């Protein structure tokens, strides 16, 4: 009885991947299907080894090793498209290591994950990064601030935003985080109050509200 | 005038509420106390009345507090009414 | 087989079948008639079944409206009474239309309820409304919202556009392949 | 910023003309004094008091104002 | 054959049967007197009918109309009761009329209810209305916006265009294939 | 034969009987007496009727007028309640009339419910009419507006062309050979 | 049992084509006619194979392959009143293109449509179409303001207008939209209250808005 | 086995099963039916399951709703027992909305009750409110938070973003393995 | 058993083809369509693999991958018109790239359509997608901004929007997204309290001047 | 009134109607 047999009709939707180790590691898309998957073992239907494995978990495990023997290494994240040929992007300029410290670095990847034959690392650019999430912004025509910082960027969008903005926001940065993580550029988002509605005001330089006749008020 | 209106209904209606409890407590002990007279075939004036003075005096001990509840809340209420325009 | 619940209605029992049907737990219906529905699975799904109507808090309850509070029996109900009914009564309405909108699956709506004052001596305040609502695949959200909105604001004499709020979403993944029974 | 507005002016909304005109009085460089049946009018607009005594002349015939200056104070009468 | 529903009446069976029916599940109504009709699936559409009668939410409510709140035959009624239910009336006859129009199947009509207020002593709002209608297709809608604008402008004693909202859409895909029989 | 519907009256079952003849469906009428009619199909032709029952909301509601909500039959009539029977009943004298016109098949009037205030202390507004009607074959509409105008005009103590309404339409093509029968 | 046999009574409703792919092609006048015959196949009462058409259904196929092959190509309508010789209306300014690139064109409609012998293209003029729109609009007496633009016409009927003057409208309109589409000319017609709602108001370039007496608003030049 | 508990509710048992499961307990339940349900395990686990249920104060209690200090059954109903049933209802309707966002597990709502006073003769309070939710695993809780404001906001009469708290959490680990039985 | 007789009656409503992969392909044209295929592969009706696809998924799962391995190509969008030989449209100003590796690119999408047998790439000029925006607004006499950015084109429409303007709005909209794509150029419709449809002005002694684009609008006092 | 400058007046007070002209 083969594990593909048990996961169901839609053979498309599982990917089985034999390891060094020797266990089987389920390809899963979601979480939805990863416990569609992780029943079956857990009730116990097969009998060998096996494994359920998903890009965010993995990303995320992967991480938590760099931490600790690799804590000042800036880099972006692992795509598996290919999961026997993972891609990891690191900084090209907040990176500064030999041909062989980094061929070493792939090998000791490639001993943790004992499913794929093999790790490319490839240089990215952060000024592209940081362009194409300001180009995204301003192509939704949101309202936004920039702050730069030694080692990240951060885009602060404040005010009484319209419902058709917040949807085109949520949708915009959900887009980026998956392609770059969030890592290098942080996204803000702050509702706030209106004053304004129905009051006078002076604008510019000297500028100030007034609540009514006879009461001004002087915001910094 | 829906003001006028609410305010003269909402007057008969608790006429009609405040005077019920009484009367109906009076009521069914005069009946109660009038039949125990046919079956034990035994007359006298004085006795409904005894009773029923007793069970109005306990009717008004026990609901009194929400009489004035009540009056309050409608003395008020017609007041901001009648000054309501400014 | 272990039991799980009893005396479900018509409409616990399938939405119970639903949320254990998609977690791939195989589960049975029984009709006791004046005793309802009955809710079984195998001893291996056992735990996980436990689990996930926890997590879940089922069965569902029943669905709330206010003008279950104020069934009136009086002569004179007050005029909190009356307007909590009607209002109630113009939200459900408003369901219903939206229904029907190109592509809708469902919707909920909301209304500010001015009558927790009877305006007894004080001006009526402006109305605000909420609504909810899911979509089909393949939709234009974004392109969407303009038409809810126009609809919403002339259903009622004062309201702007910045007091109506809009939340929509899509349709999650269909489930069509049934369940791996135990081996 | 609470005031998030790009340029410079002043938004008047439903504002007596001796509030309105205080706004202006800066710009004049001169205290402004305004009769009280003047003060009955209203106005509601954006503006530009980018040259305030070619302003002040063309609204004055435009609302009927009648206007002095005596070298201290600018006096607007109806 | 599993039970999905029972004691329905025949327009929510109808109903049923015609939403399966789009999503390719053969389908069978069954009749059994004060019981009510019984709907049956065979065993590998179960999963997928489940699926859909949760998305749906069926089986359908009844239709909400206001008058149902403030019934005809109380001992007394206030003045916010009868004019709720003659603008409850006036909203079924309006939708009545639209559905003869050239080419319309249906229609949704909402008026703004000022009734919530007494507008006593005081200026009575003017009317606000919205409607939704649906058409066969082929039918040019930008030119059909104009005569229904025009049609209810003249319903009431003081309306502005500018407070008509109308919404149409067009008629689905015809369904005139029977669903495939499990093999 | 699958059963569609029961229990209907006579002028539902000639409605639901004109629809689906419109689109090639054979279907027959049985009548049970104190029970009503019943309408029944072929298999093959049983998911399209469905699909079209659905699309139109058969079976039709019962026609809404506004005197059904104050009854006459009642103890006692509040003055708005018979300022209201009053007009329920101008409406429906006009169409009667229009219906006699040459060449008119049928139509629908409206008229502003001015009773909607009492307008006790204040100046009555002035009346607004709307008419809907549906001409046979070869009628030239244009010139029949303004004779339905002219008559309308002179109905009411003060009303102006301005502010009459009146859309027109003509018959659709007849439906005059039967349906074919299912091989 | 032939198909004709099946569509009805009434012989003349219905047009049946033979196809080089080897199909029935039944020609359909309307909406109506079309879900007539489409109920006769789909309950399988015929047992080959067989397809129903109209004219606008197969309007807008083809422009939706247009749109990917050619998407520069001018062009009005495709007429199908004899459906073994259609007609491609083609304008005569805004289109450069040889005699033999027209053939290719030719060849590749005659591709999409395998119950048409030939197809027949003819270059008309714009001047012509825009001339019987606005002749169209004076005789009926409504009152409209014409825009150019590079690529189209437009003609925008807005105001307060009477029921007659929809009515003529909306029966003008119809006419025009079956002989030319709706390509190169919009008719845009919209109702209007009065533009300032019974306001006191001076316009032009120092123009402004009466509130009320006592209070002017100064929105915009009018 | 030794008895933990009897007379349990259906709810009551289930809640007691996953919290014992969840510590590697196996344990029984059985129906007595007009007696209720009964939990038992084994000695090995009996003090375990002892100090678990000790420390989670099991068997849990019955839900409380403000509307059950206020039952409708008088013949006048005072102002502040209206009010109170008034809030009680919404906030229930608005926990069952929020529950039909997109993810979201579970959810509860609080408001200000400002009728601890009559609000009589005194200018009534703005309103605050609390929400609290569970999302599935892997949400962008801080763009979700978004969302969840901009639908309270408008579902009241005045409400500042100032004024409302929302708190978040995800999902706990799945408990899907079945615990080892006592050798 | 073959697949066809499983699908249903009307035959010509979807397309099945062969791929290298050794597993049937079933196109159809909708979402509705979709899920009538997908549910006889899930009942288990068929034996053999087989998947069901349509033209939105396949643009969703090419753009993924695209968005790892060529991370900075400018492209529209991939017609599949003709399935077996799709058009992939790119930009002829944003790219730079040899005819080798064009080449290469081609050879890489159909590894990953295993049921096409060739992909054409096709290159388009962005001047035209953003002149055939504007001049499709114009000839709906809409009221719009037009914004510029290096990348991009937005166009913002946004105010008291009257019914029959928000309906032919949409109507175009989701013409032009479906032949373009939303990458390059962006539309949005916002409904504002606001009268002047987006229009903006100061008054100052010189008359009125315009002002420029901006997040804060003046409410409606009307 | 596509060019030049005047004055759509509704029952206004010759107040405000003179007003209006006195720019001019
Ligand atoms: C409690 C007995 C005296 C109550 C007097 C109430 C007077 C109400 C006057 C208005 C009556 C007519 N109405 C209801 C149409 O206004
Ligand atoms: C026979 C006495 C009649 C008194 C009528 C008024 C009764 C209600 C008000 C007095 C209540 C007195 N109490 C119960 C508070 O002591
Ligand atoms: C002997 C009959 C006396 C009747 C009047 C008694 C005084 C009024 C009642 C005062 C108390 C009212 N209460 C119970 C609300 O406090």
Same mark, same amino acid.
């Not at chain 1, 093999?118 to 592209?128: A, F, Q, R, Y």
């Not at chain 2, 009056?71 to 009648?82: E, P, T």
């Not at chain 3, 969407?144 to 004499?157: E, G, H, M, V, W």
């Given at each position: 009885?083969?594990?593909?047999?048990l996961?169901?009709?839609?053979?498309?939707?599982?990917?089985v991947?034999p390891?060094?180790?020797?266990?089987?590691?389920?390809?899963?898309?979601?979480?939805?299907?990863?416990?569609?998957?992780?029943?079956?073992?857990?009730?116990?239907?097969?009998?060998?080894?096996?494994?359920?494995?998903?890009?965010?978990?993995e990303?995320?495990?992967?991480?938590i090793?760099?931490?600790?023997?690799?804590?000042?290494?800036?880099?972006?994240?692992?795509?598996?498209?290919?999961?026997?040929?993972?891609?990891?992007?690191?900084?090209?300029?907040?990176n500064?290591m030999?041909?062989?410290?980094?061929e070493?670095?792939?090998?000791?990847l490639?001993?943790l994950?004992?499913?794929?034959?093999?790790?490319?690392?490839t240089?990215?650019?952060?000024?592209?990064?940081?362009?194409?999430?300001?180009?995204?912004?301003?192509?939704?025509?949101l309202?936004?601030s920039?702050?730069?910082?030694?080692?990240?960027?951060?885009?602060?969008?404040?005010?009484?935003?319209?419902?058709?903005?917040?949807?085109?926001?949520?949708?915009?940065?959900?887009?980026?985080?998956?392609?770059?993580?969030?890592?290098?550029?942080?996204?803000?988002?702050?509702?706030?109050?209106?004053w304004?509605?129905?009051?006078?005001?002076?604008?510019?330089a000297?500028?100030?509200?007034?609540?009514?006749?006879?009461?001004?008020?002087?915001?910094? | 005038?829906?003001?006028l209106?609410?305010? !003269?209904?909402?007057?008969?209606?608790?006429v009609?509420?405040?005077? +019920?409890?009484?009367?109906?407590?009076?009521?069914?002990?005069?009946?109660?106390?009038?039949?125990?007279?046919?079956?034990?075939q035994?007359?006298?004036?004085?006795?409904?009345?005894?009773?029923?003075?007793? !069970?109005?005096?306990?009717?008004?001990?026990?609901?009194? !507090?929400?009489?004035?509840?009540?009056?309050?809340?409608?003395?008020?209420?017609?007041?901001?009414?009648?000054?309501?325009? +400014? | 087989?272990?039991?799980?619940?009893?005396?479900?209605?018509?409409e616990?029992?399938n939405?119970?079948?639903?949320?254990?049907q998609?977690?791939?737990?195989?589960?049975?219906?029984?009709?006791?008639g004046k005793?309802?529905?009955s809710?079984?699975?195998?001893?291996?799904? *056992?735990?996980?079944?436990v689990?996930?109507?926890?997590?879940?808090?089922?069965?569902?309850?029943?669905?709330?409206?206010?003008?279950?509070m *104020?069934?009136?029996?009086?002569?004179?109900?007050?005029?909190?009474?009356?307007?909590?009914?009607?209002?109630?009564?113009?939200?459900?309405?408003?369901?219903?239309?939206?229904?029907?909108?190109?592509?809708?699956?469902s919707?909920?709506?909301?209304?500010?309820?001015?009558?927790?004052?009877?305006?007894?001596?004080?001006?009526?305040?402006?109305?605000?409304?909420?609504?909810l609502?899911?979509?089909?695949?393949?939709?234009?959200?974004?392109?969407?919202?303009?038409?809810?909105?126009? *609809?919403?604001?002339n259903? *009622?004499?004062?309201?702007?556009?910045?007091?109506?709020?809009?939340?929509?979403?899509?349709?999650?993944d269909?489930?069509?392949?049934?369940p791996?029974?135990?081996? | 910023?609470?005031?998030?507005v790009?340029?410079?002016?002043?938004?008047?909304?439903? @504002?007596?003309?001796?509030?309105?005109?205080?706004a202006?009085?800066?710009?004049?460089?001169?205290?402004?004094?305004?009769?009280?049946?003047?003060?009955?009018?209203?106005?509601?607009?954006?503006?530009?008091?980018? @040259?305030?005594?070619?302003?002040?002349?063309?609204?004055?015939?435009?609302?009927?104002?009648?206007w002095?200056?005596?070298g201290?104070?600018?006096?607007?009468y109806?």
């Amino acid at each position: 009885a083969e594990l593909d047999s048990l996961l169901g009709q839609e053979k498309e939707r599982f990917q089985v991947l034999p390891g060094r180790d020797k266990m089987l590691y389920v390809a899963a898309q979601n979480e939805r299907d990863t416990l569609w998957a992780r029943q079956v073992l857990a009730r116990g239907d097969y009998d060998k080894n096996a494994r359920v494995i998903n890009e965010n978990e993995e990303n995320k495990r992967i991480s938590i090793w760099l931490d600790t023997y690799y804590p000042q290494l800036a880099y972006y994240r692992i795509h598996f498209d290919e999961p026997r040929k993972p891609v990891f992007w690191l900084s090209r300029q907040r990176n500064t290591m030999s041909k062989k410290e980094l061929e070493v670095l792939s090998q000791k990847l490639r001993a943790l994950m004992p499913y794929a034959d093999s790790v490319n690392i490839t240089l990215m650019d952060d000024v592209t990064a940081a362009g194409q999430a300001e180009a995204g912004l301003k192509q939704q025509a949101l309202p936004y601030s920039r702050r730069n910082h030694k080692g990240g960027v951060t885009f602060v969008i404040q005010g009484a935003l319209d419902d058709v903005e917040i949807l085109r926001a949520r949708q915009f940065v959900d887009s980026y985080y998956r392609t770059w993580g969030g890592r290098y550029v942080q996204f803000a988002i702050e509702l706030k109050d209106d004053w304004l509605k129905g009051r006078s005001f002076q604008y510019g330089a000297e500028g100030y509200i007034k609540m009514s006749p006879g009461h001004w008020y002087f915001p910094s | 005038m829906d003001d006028l209106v609410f305010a !003269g209904n909402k007057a008969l209606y608790l006429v009609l509420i405040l005077s +019920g409890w009484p009367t109906i407590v009076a009521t069914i002990i005069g009946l109660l106390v009038g039949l125990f007279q046919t079956v034990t075939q035994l007359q006298e004036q004085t006795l409904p009345f005894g009773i029923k003075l007793l !069970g109005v005096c306990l009717c008004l001990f026990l609901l009194s !507090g929400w009489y004035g509840e009540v009056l309050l809340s409608y003395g008020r209420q017609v007041i901001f009414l009648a000054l309501a325009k +400014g | 087989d272990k039991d799980l619940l009893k005396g479900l209605d018509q409409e616990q029992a399938n939405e119970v079948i639903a949320v254990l049907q998609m977690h791939n737990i195989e589960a049975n219906k029984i009709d006791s008639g004046k005793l309802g529905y009955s809710i079984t699975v195998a001893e291996p799904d *056992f735990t996980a079944a436990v689990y996930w109507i926890k997590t879940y808090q089922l069965p569902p309850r029943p669905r709330v409206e206010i003008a279950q509070m *104020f069934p009136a029996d009086s002569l004179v109900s007050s005029p909190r009474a009356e307007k909590a009914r009607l209002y109630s009564a113009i939200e459900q309405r408003l369901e219903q239309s939206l229904q029907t909108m190109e592509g809708v699956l469902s919707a909920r709506v909301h209304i500010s309820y001015d009558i927790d004052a009877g305006e007894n001596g004080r001006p009526p305040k402006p109305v605000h409304l909420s609504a909810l609502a899911v979509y089909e695949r393949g939709s234009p959200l974004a392109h969407q919202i303009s038409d809810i909105k126009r *609809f919403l604001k002339n259903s *009622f004499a004062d309201v702007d556009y910045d007091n109506i709020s809009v939340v929509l979403s899509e349709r999650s993944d269909a489930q069509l392949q049934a369940p791996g029974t135990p081996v | 910023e609470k005031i998030p507005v790009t340029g410079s002016g002043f938004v008047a909304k439903d @504002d007596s003309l001796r509030t309105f005109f205080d706004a202006m009085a800066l710009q004049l460089k001169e205290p402004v004094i305004v009769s009280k049946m003047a003060a009955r009018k209203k106005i509601t607009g954006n503006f530009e008091f980018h @040259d305030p005594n070619a302003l002040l002349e063309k609204l004055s015939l435009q609302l009927g104002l009648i206007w002095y200056f005596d070298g201290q104070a600018i006096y607007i009468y109806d």
